[PDB]
Amino acid sequence: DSRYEHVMKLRQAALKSARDMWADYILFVDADNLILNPDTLSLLIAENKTVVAPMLDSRAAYSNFWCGMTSQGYYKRTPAY
Amino acid sequence: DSRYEHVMKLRQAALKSARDMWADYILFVDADNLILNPDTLSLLIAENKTVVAPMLDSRAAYSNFWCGMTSQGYYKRTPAY
């Protein structure tokens, strides 16, 4: 739980320091994600949505988006995955 | 000439600190100008020009815009004033 708390505080601090600096957009990248296409940022900017995330490939069915919450925020396979 | 130099440096510093802060537009107001209309800023923003200045009234023909430079940057009355 302490690791969770630390991650929350760090991300909230990043968001707050992105607001008091007058910069639109903020791209949350982590350590292991390999952004390969050089035009990812422009193609995400050209969509005009508040929150939008590219779909990243993997060696299994795993990716970085869900399709349903069961009752208390748990994964559920929707037939549209 | 020292007063001129000081004014140049101060205004350039203001402009430079307006650029490294990620703020569009910058409204140069001085001490004696009385901005009376509360909608001046919005009506200037809604014009889509780089540099634009409202025409301020005065007790004489004096105002805050010229209409011609003679040879070395001096006033000249154009018939369109």
What class, by secondary structure content of chain A? mainly alpha
Order of helices and strands of chain A: HH
The coarse overall form of chain A would be: globular
Number of beta-strand segments of chain A: 0
Total number of helices of chain A: 2
Largest sheet of chain A: none
What oligomeric state do these chains adopt?
part of a larger assembly
Q: Strand content of the residues of chain A, in percent?
A: under 5%
Largest interface: A-B, 3 and 3 residues
PDB class: cytosolic protein
Keywords: complex, hydroxylase, glycosyltransferase, cytosolic protein
Entry title: Human lysine O-link glycosylation complex, LH3/ColGalT1 tetramer with bound UDP-galactose
Chains A, B: Procollagen galactosyltransferase 1
In summary, what is this structure?
Chain A has 81 residues and is an all-alpha fold. Chain A has helices at 2-19, 40-45.
Key features?
2 helices; 0% strand; part of a larger assembly; 2 chains; Procollagen galactosyltransferase 1 (chains A, B); mainly alpha; cytosolic protein; 81 residues
Write structural notes for this entry.
Chains A, B: Beta-galactosyltransferase that transfers beta-galactose to hydroxylysine residues of type I collagen. By acting on collagen glycosylation, facilitates the formation of collagen triple helix. Also involved in the biosynthesis of collagen type IV. Chains A, B: It is found in: Endoplasmic reticulum lumen. Chains A, B: Belongs to the glycosyltransferase 25 family. Chains A, B: This is Procollagen galactosyltransferase 1. Chains A, B: Glycans are attached at residue 48. The structure is cut from a larger assembly and holds two copies of chain A (81 residues). Chain A is mainly alpha-helical. Chain A contains two helices and no strands. The longest helix of chain A has 18 residues, at 2-19. The two termini of chain A are 30 Å apart. The interface between A and B is small, with 3 and 3 residues.
